[PDB]
Amino acid sequence: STLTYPFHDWSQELSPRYAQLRASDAPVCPVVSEGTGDPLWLVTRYATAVKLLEDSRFSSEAAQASGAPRQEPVELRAPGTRGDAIAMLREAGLRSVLADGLGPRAVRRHQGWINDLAETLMSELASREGTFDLAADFVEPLSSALVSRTLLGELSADERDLLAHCADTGLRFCGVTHEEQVHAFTQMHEFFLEHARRLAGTPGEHLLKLIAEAPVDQGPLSDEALAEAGSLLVVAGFPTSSGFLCGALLTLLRHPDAVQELHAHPERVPSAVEELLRYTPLSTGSVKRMATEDLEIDGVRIKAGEVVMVSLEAVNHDPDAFEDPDVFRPGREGPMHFGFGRGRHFCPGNRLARCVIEATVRAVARRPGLRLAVAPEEISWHEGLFFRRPRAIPATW
Ligand code: HEM
Ligand SMILES: [Br-]
Ligand SMILES: [Br-]
Ligand SMILES: [Cl-]
Ligand SMILES: [Cl-]
Ligand SMILES: [Cl-]
Ligand SMILES: [Cl-]
Ligand code: NA
């Protein structure tokens, strides 16, 4: 194939290429990685994505082994490490602890201060005269608090900035040198080699503490393994939450009549949270799986070792699954969205994510009149990030 991937759609306007692919006859389409030249397959239709992501012979772990074709310009790991940290934790027998640190018990522990913080932040903005920046003044402190209090432990401001910077530098398709990307993973790993044990020991019930204290049959977790967990929690939790919350705010500010309904009918907020997860695009790339044997999906042969990608954004905008997919329609009763993926790799951060998204939507819904202070086309976007994010969101009442 000569069609290079990704499609350079760094703003909320999805590349028209996704619709062209969806409308093609084949359910799986060949592309080539811009960053590596590797051949890849790409799925954009909901019905095919379901079959792929629910078939465990298309392996997520195997899409990382050395030699695997990939979309990313560099491997998403510090050199010399395993980089399969979620598998390593599950292998060590910690699914129990992961459920306790990320599941409904964690939401019950944290939802109180998350909603308090969202309201405090929004209230401070409501008290200002003039304009403010919802990215710097709302999303950054809320997402930083989520990561510190629920995942990593008490971070200094400088530590928070280092991790934010490593995530933004390493999780990119372009904009920096390959060497700079690899070094961002190395810097993050070296940080947690030195400090993860200390962070696991700070006050709170954050996940890194729960992992460090848990019983493991093969003897407690080592320094390298705790450091691998740290890097995982940054890459999985920080740029996703910050990018999504920024994008969701832009969606809410562009749909005032939706917000006025939520203001009038607070019980409708959960439905709007689910529609944001469908409608708001986050990743500029795709989830990936490697065929572990010769496989055939909807009639296309995939050879052992080939990698198949699913664009969650394309699937969430598939008109065969959603009527009027490019309309923001809370309470549309269609199928489940793909914002958190599908099947056995469904985002385990989904409970905490929904908590922070719900808190954000309610903070907005309680205060009608919030609007962009510039036109949407004047919003400036970070170009090349895996997780789309605006540079600023100028806003006002
Ligand atoms: C902020 C909004 C978030 C969104 C939209 C999001 C989205 C996703 C998606 C789509 C996947 C599936 C990847 C795949 O199929 O290969 C995923 C996986 C994952 N997410 Fe999230 N995520 C978010 C936040 C978080 C948070 C806060 C955490 C941790 C606290 C987290 C931890 C993980 C982990 C560990 C995985 C890998 C699971 C596996 O491969 O089995 N995510 N996330
Ligand atoms: Br846009
Ligand atoms: Br629908
Ligand atoms: Cl899990
Ligand atoms: Cl879990
Ligand atoms: Cl509970
Ligand atoms: Cl007030
Ligand atoms: Na380079």
Numbering used by the authors: 2 to 398
What does the paper say about this structure?
Further, the in vitro assay confirmed that NasF5053 could produce NAS-C (47.4%), Asp-A (44.4%), as well as a minor product NAS-B (8.2%) (trace I). NasF5053 adopts the prism-like fold characteristic for P450s, consisting of a large domain of 10-helices (C-L) and a small domain of four α-helices (A, B, B’, and K’) and three β-sheets (strands β1-1 to 4, β2-1 to 2, and β3-1 to 2). Our systematic mutagenesis studies on the promiscuous NasF5053 and the versatile NascB identified four key resides, Q65, A86, S284, and V288, which play critical roles in controlling product regio-configurations and stereo-configurations. To obtain insights into the structural basis for regio-specificity, stereo-specificity, and chemical versatility, we further determined high-resolution crystal structures of wild-type NasF5053 in its substrate-free and substrate-bound form, and of two NasF5053 mutants (Q65I-A86G and S284A-V288A) in their substrate-bound forms.
Comparison between the substrate-free and substrate-bound NasF5053 structures reveals binding of substrates only invokes minimal conformational changes, with a root-mean-square deviation (RMSD) of 0.362 Å (for 388 Cα atoms) between the two forms. Instead, substrate binding is associated with rearrangements of some of the residues lining the substrate-binding cavity. Upon substrate binding, the side-chains of both D85 and E73 rotate along the Cα-Cβ axis away from the binding site, to accommodate the substrates. Q65 undergoes a 2.0 Å shift (measured on the Cδ atom) toward the binding site, to interact with one of the substrate molecules (cWL-PL-U; see below). Notably, Q65, D85, and E73 all reside in the long αB’-αC loop.
